[PDB]
Amino acid sequence: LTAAQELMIQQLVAAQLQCNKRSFSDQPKVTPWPLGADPASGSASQQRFAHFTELAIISVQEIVDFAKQVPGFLQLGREDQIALLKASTIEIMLLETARRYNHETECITFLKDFTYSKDDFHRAGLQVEFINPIFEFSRAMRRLGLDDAEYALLIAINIFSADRPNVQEPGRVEALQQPYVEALLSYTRIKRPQDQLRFPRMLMKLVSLRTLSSVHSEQVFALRLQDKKLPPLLSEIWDHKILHRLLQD
Amino acid sequence: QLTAAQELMIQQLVAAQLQCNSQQRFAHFTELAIISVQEIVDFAKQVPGFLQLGREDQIALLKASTIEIMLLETARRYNHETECITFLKDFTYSKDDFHRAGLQVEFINPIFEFSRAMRRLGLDDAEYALLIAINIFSADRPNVQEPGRVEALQQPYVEALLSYTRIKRPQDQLRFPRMLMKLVSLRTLSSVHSEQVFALRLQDKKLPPLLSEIWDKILHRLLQD
Ligand SMILES: CC(C)(C)OC(=O)N1CC[C@]2(C(=O)Nc3ccccc32)[C@H]1c1cccc(-c2ccc(CO)c(S(C)(=O)=O)c2)c1
Ligand SMILES: CC(C)(C)OC(=O)N1CC[C@]2(C(=O)Nc3ccccc32)[C@H]1c1cccc(-c2ccc(CO)c(S(C)(=O)=O)c2)c1
């Protein structure tokens, strides 16, 4: 790997790293998880759902703030910036969700120490048909055994997709992606020269994430139909004045 | 370098593909679409390892893959000098001639976008045949009976394609990633096609039971014969 890449990966891992620290700043701020309440309680399930949406908000903010730190993103037009973000934010979140999965306990730890099992997502009114794919995806990512550099590069590759809808300049975004693919290819050859198929398997997770983006759109439509109210930011992304405000700041 | 077993398997796949190879024009396209599905399932049965899986697994992988291979096969037949797509021997159609048959314009142009994108990649018969086999053996499909087996069935083709592209185009080290990114594209084009097929339904253009079944039985009979 060339020296300009080595600095870039260090820049990307640091930006990811700086974002992980920020939320913890926000952990006390969240709505509390209901304790001592009935699992079947419709009242309690709504508070559990409200808890997760606020966590989901903090994650969207992290991804937006990370996207501004990755080189070449802010050089694009704001209409393109959000167009890349709408499509990617959910996929970036499932990567981050997979990153926070523990196979020993089978629990996903959000923020500093907010741990939840497969049942806890079910008790927030989320269907198991939508929950189980996220856990299957989370197990598949642990088998690859990705590190901070490989995640961060895979995140940037995922952001710069010309394949997204409503992208005005696909050539420029594909040109912007190529260096991140170069860096990731060259980085995977130094780390595991023995395993040549390690890098292809990473790029096929981006294939998985597109189906996972689509099932999430099916879920969100069902949750709005089931009277589970999303915050304005999250509903704006998955239906963009609010989203301009983060990027402009 | 490729082994003689790997080289023989590639030429097995290329040989397998070559063996299978308004209202009036609409009936034509659906009649053409069935032939492609029949070519896909027949080709799928030529692929080594596809028939050692359970029918529940076989159908799950086909059902998801048929469009994605149809779109890959559509891209091959596109000619950029004319901007026309050539089906079978002598059936050539422009984007307007697709539009005149009642196919919606919002869905047509992404397919044409994909066809030009595939043209720029400049895939050959071998690379195409490997990419179709890689697409068939995808573990992220709905209704997985056994996802661990299909990942193992995919590996030989991904290894073959990786080693092939490094030999065929050693200068272009990123040739192999781009063609994997087209599988990422083909997933959104898959979910897009579901949205299209639905739109024709309400225009009083219901798909025939084979295409209705796949893009919602008859698929067992095609796999059986
Ligand atoms: C629909 C609402 C808005 C409630 O939720 C979401 O859109 N998602 C996306 C994925 C998500 C889901 O749908 N099922 C699920 C099962 C397990 C793990 C995550 C999820 C959920 C979620 C639920 C709880 C937490 C997160 C979350 C995802 C990523 C990150 C990492 O940045 C963080 S956090 C707060 O720790 O930053 C939180 C996501
Ligand atoms: C809705 C019905 C069921 C009628 O159509 C389809 O689902 N498809 C899938 C792809 C398709 C589409 O949706 N828009 C479109 C625009 C241009 C080119 C192909 C298409 C179309 C099609 C239309 C006409 C021909 C084909 C076709 C696609 C592939 C092959 C070869 O594999 C052959 S053929 C007959 O030459 O074997 C025909 C596909």
Q: Per the structure block, which two tokens stand in for A6? A: 């080595």
> Which chain B residues are Cβ-neighbours of A200 within 8 angstroms?
158, 162, 176, 180
Q: Quick one: which of B193, B34, B33 has its CA closest to B106?
A: B193
Radius of gyration of chain A (CA): 18
**Type of residue numbered A122:** H
Q: Per the structure block, which two tokens stand in for B194? A: 């579901």
- Dihedral angle over CA of B32, B36, B41, B44, nearest 10: 170
Rounded distance between C-alpha atoms, residue B181 and residue B179, angstroms: 5
Q: What structural domains and CATH numbers belong to chain B?
A: 1-225 (1.10.565.10)
**Number of the ligand closest to the Cα of B190:** 2
Q: Quick one: which of B115, B105, B112, B83 has its CA closest to B182?
A: B115
Answer whether B187 sits within 8 Å of A204, measured CB to CB. Answer: no
Ligand 1 geometric centre to CA of B152 (Å): 31
Partner-chain residue, chosen from A178, A181, A207, that has the shortest CB–CB distance to B183: A207
Answer whether B159 sits within 8 Å of A210, measured CB to CB. Answer: no
Resolution in angstroms for this experimental structure? 2.8
Place of tokens 């990370």: A66
Rounded distance between C-alpha atoms, residue A5 and residue A182, angstroms: 9
DSSP H or E segment with residue B33: helix B23-46
Non-local (6+) Cβ contacts of A165 within 8 A are: A83, A87
Q: Does B194 touch chain A (CB under 8 A)?
A: no
Q: Does B116 touch chain A (CB under 8 A)?
A: no
Non-local (6+) Cβ contacts of B144 within 8 A are: B57, B60, B150
